[PDB]
C-alpha cells in the first residue's frame, strides 16, 4: 500500500503544459483540492484513500515548485544532502522549515526547492513527505548539517 | 574502527561556549539528534556509521554532564568508573544499585546525575569502552568495582 513515486514523477514531467501551469499557481497545498487538473493527475495513484491523499497533497505541492526544479537522480541522495549540496541554503532556513507549523512548512519547503533546485533521489523524499513528522525533520537536519560540515 | 575517545574528550574540551551550552541542556541522549553542534562534534569520530552512533550518543551524553565533571587521568588498567564513583565518596551504594538495575535511556540519565554528583577522576577511554558495550556484564562490573573499592 505505497504510492508509486517514480510513476508520479513521470506523470508530472509528461503532463501537458497547461495543467501543470494550473497546478503551480496554487499558493498552499489545501488549495490544490480546488483544482481539477490536480485530481486528473493524482487519480491513478489512489487519491480515494485518505492517508494517500494527504501524502499526495504534499508530494504534488513539492512537485509544483517548478517542473525542472527537482532533478530526480538515482543511486540515494536525501533532501538534506541535496539542499546542502546546493550551497545556497543557510542552516537557519532549514531550521525555519523544521520548526514551521502546519501548511507553512510546505510553503517554506517549496521556496527552499525553488531556491536550491536540488539534485536528489525523489522516491526517498516522497517517503519523507509521507511520514512528515519529527523523525524526518530530524534526519533532514542531520543530513544537512553533516553534508555542510564536510565541505 | 574504534572511536578515538581521547580525541573526542579534547574535542569536547576545547569546544566553544555556545555549542557546548547547546549540547549541555539536553535532557536525554536521543535529544542530541536535534542539536547540529552534536553532529559537528561527532562527525569526525564515525557518526555516519550506526554502531558508532549509539556508542557516541552515550559518550557525548556523559560528557554533556559538563566540561569539568569527568577528569581524565592517565594509567599508571586505569581507574574504572565504578572505582571513580566510589573514590569520590559522595555516592550512596543504593544509587549505584538503582543505576545498574535501570533500563534504556533512564540508565543514562541516572548515570549523568551520578557523574554530576561525584565529579569522578577516571581513565576516560576505559569508560568509553564500557559505554560502547554497556551490556549486563558491564553494569554488574560497575556495581562490583564500586563495592570492592569501599
Amino acid at each position: 500500500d505505497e504510492i508509486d513515486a517514480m510513476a508520479l514523477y513521470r506523470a508530472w514531467q509528461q503532463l501537458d503544459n497547461g495543467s501543470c501551469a494550473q497546478i503551480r499557481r496554487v499558493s498552499e497545498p489545501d488549495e490544490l483540492r480546488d483544482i481539477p487538473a490536480f485530481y486528473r493527475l493524482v487519480q491513478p495513484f489512489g487519491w480515494e484513500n485518505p492517508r494517500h491523499q494527504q501524502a499526495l497533497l504534499r508530494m504534488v505541492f513539492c512537485l509544483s515548485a517548478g517542473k525542472n526544479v527537482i532533478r530526480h537522480q538515482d543511486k540515494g541522495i536525501s533532501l538534506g544532502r541535496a539542499l546542502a549540496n546546493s550551497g545556497r541554503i543557510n542552516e537557519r532556513r532549514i531550521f525555519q522549515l523544521i520548526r514551521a507549523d502546519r501548511t507553512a512548512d510546505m510553503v517554506q519547503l517549496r521556496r527552499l526547492l525553488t531556491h536550491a533546485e536540488p539534485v536528489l533521489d525523489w522516491p526517498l523524499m516522497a517517503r519523507m513527505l509521507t511520514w512528515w513528522g519529527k523523525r524526518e525533520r530530524q534526519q533532514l537536519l542531520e543530513d544537512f548539517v553533516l553534508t555542510t560540515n564536510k565541505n | 574502527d574504534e572511536i578515538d575517545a581521547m580525541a573526542l574528550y579534547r574535542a569536547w574540551q576545547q569546544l566553544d561556549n555556545g555549542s557546548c551550552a547547546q549540547i549541555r541542556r539536553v535532557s536525554e541522549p536521543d535529544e542530541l539528534r536535534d542539536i547540529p553542534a552534536f553532529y559537528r562534534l561527532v562527525q569526525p569520530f564515525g557518526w555516519e556509521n550506526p554502531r558508532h552512533q549509539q556508542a557516541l550518543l552515550r559518550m557525548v551524553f556523559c560528557l554533556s554532564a559538563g566540561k569539568n565533571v569527568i577528569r581524565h587521568q592517565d594509567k599508571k588498567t586505569g581507574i574504572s568508573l565504578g572505582r571513580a564513583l566510589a573514590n569520590s565518596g559522595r555516592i550512596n551504594e543504593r544509587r549505584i544499585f538503582q543505576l545498574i538495575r535501570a533500563d534504556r535511556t533512564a540508565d543514562m540519565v541516572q548515570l549523568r546525575r551520578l557523574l554530576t554528583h561525584a565529579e569522578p577522576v577516571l581513565d576516560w577511554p576505559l569508560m568509553a569502552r564500557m559505554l560502547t558495550w554497556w551490556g549486563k556484564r558491564e553494569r554488574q562490573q560497575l556495581l562490583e568495582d564500586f563495592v570492592l573499592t569501599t
Partner: protein, 352 residues
C-alpha cells in the same frame, strides 16, 4: 462448572503500587516487552487486610513466626475459655516447638494461624489428656477426621483460598491446605517505560538549597488481573461447605479483585482507580486471557479501549476455537453486559 474465572482490566493513574529490593517498580517481560507488575502476594494481602473483607468474609488469619508473642496473644484471647497450660501445650503440639516462658521462641517459618482453629485444637488436647490419651494416639485420632479442622478454617477463609504449609509440628499432618482460588500477577497490557520523579526535601533551617535530593520510579498503567477460584476445593477447605457459600465468597473475591488496590505510595500518588472492566466466566478447567496482551497493546485514544477490545477479540477467538460455552457474564462500563457490578455479582451468586 467447577471453576470460577475472574478477569479484570483496571487502569491506574500515575503511581507505584509494587516495588522491589531497590524501591523500583516491579516488572515482568511479556511478549518481549517490559510490563509493570503487581505481585500476586501484594494483591492477596491487600484484599485480606481490606475493610470489605473484614465486613463481608471475616477475620484474616494471623501470620507469624514469633511463637512467644503468639503464646501471649492466645493467652490473652483464649484465657477465659482454657487454662494457660493447655494453651501452651497446644501451641507446642501444633508448632513442634517447646513453649515455655522464653523472651524469644521462633517457629520453623512464617505460618498462618487461626485463633478459632487453635481453640478447637486445645479443646481436643484437654479432652485428650483428661482421657489419659497421649500425644501420638491423639495425632492418629485427629488424623482420622480433617473436615472439622477445616470448618475451623471457615474461621480463617484466606487460608482456605490461598493455602498453608508447615514443616514442623502436628500442622505438618493436619494443617496442609491447598489453596482454593488461584491468582496471577497483575501485568500491564502494554509496554511501559517507567518515569522517574526527581524530588527534593527542603530544610527549614537551611537557606541554601535543599536537604535531600532523590529519585523515585513511578508509572501509569492498564493492568490485567486474573484469578480463578477453585470451588470444590473451597468447599473441602471449609469443612464441607455448600456451593452457595463458596459462590458468595467467590462473589466477594470478584468485588475485591475489581476494587482493591495495594496502598503502596498511595498517600503520595493516590491511584485510587476502580476497574473499568470486569468479566466473570464459569468453566470446566481454568482459562487465562493474558495472551490477549502477548502482543503489547499499542495506544489508540488511550491504552484502555484497545486493551478491552483486544481482550474481547482474543476471548472470541478462544471461545470459537476451543468451543467453550460455559456461562459467562461480562460487566462492562467502557456474555454479558452488566450495567452495574452488582448485577454481575448477583449473577455469580446464582451459579450463573
Amino acid at each position: 462448572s467447577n471453576f470460577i474465572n475472574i478477569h479484570v482490566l483496571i487502569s491506574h493513574s500515575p503511581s507505584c503500587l509494587n516495588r522491589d529490593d531497590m524501591n523500583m517498580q516491579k516488572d515482568a517481560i511479556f511478549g518481549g516487552k517490559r510490563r509493570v507488575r503487581i505481585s500476586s502476594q501484594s494483591l492477596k494481602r491487600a484484599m485480606r487486610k481490606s475493610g470489605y473483607y473484614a465486613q463481608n468474609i471475616g477475620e484474616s488469619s494471623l501470620r507469624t513466626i514469633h511463637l512467644a508473642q503468639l503464646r501471649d496473644v492466645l493467652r490473652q484471647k483464649l484465657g477465659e475459655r482454657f487454662d494457660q497450660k493447655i494453651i501452651d501445650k497446644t501451641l507446642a503440639l501444633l508448632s513442634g516447638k517447646s513453649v515455655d516462658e522464653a523472651e524469644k521462641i521462633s517457629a520453623d517459618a512464617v505460618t498462618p494461624w487461626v485463633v478459632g482453629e487453635i481453640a478447637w485444637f486445645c479443646e481436643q488436647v484437654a479432652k485428650a489428656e483428661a482421657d489419659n490419651l497421649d500425644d501420638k494416639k491423639l495425632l492418629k485420632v485427629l488424623k482420622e477426621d480433617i473436615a472439622a479442622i477445616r470448618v475451623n478454617l471457615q474461621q480463617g477463609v484466606d487460608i482456605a483460598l490461598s493455602g498453608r504449609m508447615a514443616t514442623s509440628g502436628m500442622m505438618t499432618e493436619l494443617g496442609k491446605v491447598d489453596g482454593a482460588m488461584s491468582i496471577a500477577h497483575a501485568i500491564t497490557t502494554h509496554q511501559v517505560d517507567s518515569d522517574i520523579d526527581w524530588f527534593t526535601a527542603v530544610d527549614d533551617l537551611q537557606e541554601q538549597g535543599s536537604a535531600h535530593l532523590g529519585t523515585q520510579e513511578f508509572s501509569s498503567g492498564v493492568f490485567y488481573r486474573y484469578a480463578n477460584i477453585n470451588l470444590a476445593q473451597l468447599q473441602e477447605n471449609l469443612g464441607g461447605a455448600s456451593r452457595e457459600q463458596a459462590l458468595e465468597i467467590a462473589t466477594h473475591v470478584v468485588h475485591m479483585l475489581a476494587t482493591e488496590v495495594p496502598g503502596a505510595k498511595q498517600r503520595t500518588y493516590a491511584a485510587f482507580n476502580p476497574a473499568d472492566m470486569v468479566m466473570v466466566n464459569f468453566s470446566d478447567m481454568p482459562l487465562s486471557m493474558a495472551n490477549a496482551f502477548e502482543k503489547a497493546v499499542k495506544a489508540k485514544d488511550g491504552f484502555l479501549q484497545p486493551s478491552i477490545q483486544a481482550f474481547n477479540q482474543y476471548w472470541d477467538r478462544v471461545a470459537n476455537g476451543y468451543g467453550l460455552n460455559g456461562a459467562a457474564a461480562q460487566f462492562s462500563l467502557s456474555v454479558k453486559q452488566m450495567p452495574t457490578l452488582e448485577q454481575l455479582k448477583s449473577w455469580v451468586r446464582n451459579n450463573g
